[PDB]
Amino acid sequence: MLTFALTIVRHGETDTPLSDTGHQQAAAAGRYLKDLHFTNVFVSNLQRAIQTAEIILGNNLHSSATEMILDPLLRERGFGETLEQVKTRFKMFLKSLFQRMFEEHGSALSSADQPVIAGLADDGAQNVPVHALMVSHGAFIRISVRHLVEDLQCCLPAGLKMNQVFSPCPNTGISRFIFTIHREESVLRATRIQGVFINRKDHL
Ligand SMILES: [K+]
Ligand SMILES: [K+]
């Protein structure tokens, strides 16, 4: 059994690079996330996402030894790719994610009540040492959240409006889920998924 945190961030304002505003959004998000240790980083192959990830990491106090992995599965919906096709890509990404986390961190590391949500950057992950950062695109992230919340067994905390849960993500909007996974019949499955916060933009 392994529990890990996933922080999800939409790229900054924009294979185009970030705008100047984009850079500043990403730096603000980096400063917001600076005291978090990301043990793993995953990012779409698109420059706007890579630069956002680079800026977040360049502002981080703990994650210097963490390598950024580019994953095409995180690319934006092809504008024409169906919503189901995008969801399938997220399902494939999750499969990859569980396997990677289990292989690297194993089952002797972090082995359904409300997480502690204080409106701070480390909400729900204070005591969760394994923490992955995913930097991706707005339509993909929206579809990914629907999948996590609707299609899978999922917990959502007190006072979180469904309107917010399903809202479109702002540039550098931040979301967080906590996953618990275990190997059932040789296949890795999530036993619990806990939503913490969705599309947070306090840093803007
Ligand atoms: K559900
Ligand atoms: K709830």
Residue at 172: amino acid letter = T
Q: Half-sphere exposure of 156 toward its Cβ, with a 13 Å CA cutoff?
A: 17
d(CA 94, CA 132): 12
- CA of 181 from ligand 2 middle (Å) equals 22
d(CA 133, CA 147): 18
- The method recorded for this entry reads X-ray
* H/E segment holding residue 97: helix 83-105
- CA of 153 from ligand 2 middle (Å) equals 13
Q: Nearest ligand to the C-alpha of residue 156?
A: 2
Give the phi and the psi of residue 190 in degrees, each rounded to 5.
-75, 125
The domains of the chain, with CATH numbers, are: 1-204 (3.40.50.1240)
Resolution of the experimentally solved model in angstroms: 2.0
- CA of 30 from ligand 2 middle (Å) equals 28
Q: Nearest ligand to the C-alpha of residue 164?
A: 2
SS3 32: helix
d(CA 66, CA 80): 35
Catalytic residues, by residue number, are 11, 76
- CA of 122 from ligand 1 middle (Å) equals 24
- CA of 195 from ligand 2 middle (Å) equals 9
Q: Nearest ligand to the C-alpha of residue 195?
A: 2
